[PDB]
Amino acid sequence: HFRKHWQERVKVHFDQAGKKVSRRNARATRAAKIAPRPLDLLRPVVRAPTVKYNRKVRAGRGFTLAEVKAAGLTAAYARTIGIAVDHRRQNRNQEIFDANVQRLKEYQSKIIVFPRN
């Protein structure tokens, strides 16, 4: 596969180390600006499609509205506490829903919220 001018565009990843260092510095800056809160939002536990991988359990974008309601809070208030909320993900597994509810309940207990003022 060398019928083109590929020699004009030969991207060599010499920067790997510098890019990793820059990513670490960006993470440190985010922590400095987001010190009290975690760097990443609490993602749910979800099951994968593509049965070749359905046996695997992996994270997801955010909890569904039903999961948030069952967790004892609201979607609008959940976002401010860093809980990821998905308005398009429908719940179709009772076992996964129970695990998500338990995870949300544990997260609510582990979090401490400072006064709004």
Partner: peptide
């Protein structure tokens, strides 16, 4: 919150 990549 998520499991970090690589061992700690």
């Amino acid at each position: 919150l998520q499991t970090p990549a690589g061992g700690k």
